[PDB]
């Protein structure tokens, strides 16, 4: 399924993912596209921050859902 | 230096480490105490998951810091 990620500049990228993918997996995908290591990423959906160990489906993230990427400020 | 690890039960153990130890090395030490292979561990410090690749020092982990062990599901 396709989901969208709003990047640090407001631009939106498209990713192919699976409902069973973990948030950690998604962060790796974002690293590949954006060059931000997972430990520096905060991912936000529906106004809340997602935790690593959950699956996308655990958060009810569906086709064409949008996540927001935020850079951690206090380091890794 | 001594750090602490909260284990899957909530019980806290001590590990002997050095600031230059990598997270992968730390997972190895935890495997020796807890019997959970490194590729099934998630380690959390200060509310965030630590990456293989980095040293304890890279995360400003110090003496008496507490790491949290979580089982990958």
UniProtKB/Swiss-Prot annotation, chain A:
Phosphorylated at Ser-65 by PINK1 during mitophagy. Phosphorylated ubiquitin specifically binds and activates parkin (PRKN), triggering mitophagy. Phosphorylation does not affect E1-mediated E2 charging of ubiquitin but affects discharging of E2 enzymes to form polyubiquitin chains. It also affects deubiquitination by deubiquitinase enzymes such as USP30. Changing residue 74 to G: No effect on ADP-ribosylation. There is a cross-link at residues 6, 11, 27, 29, 33, 48, 63 (Glycyl lysine isopeptide (Lys-Gly) (interchain with G-Cter in ubiquitin)). It comes from the Eukaryota. Coiled coil: none annotated. Residues 1-76 form the Ubiquitin-like domain. This is Ubiquitin. The lineage of its organism: Eukaryota, Metazoa, Chordata, Craniata, Vertebrata. The gene is UBA52. The chain holds residues 1 to 76 of 128 of the full protein.
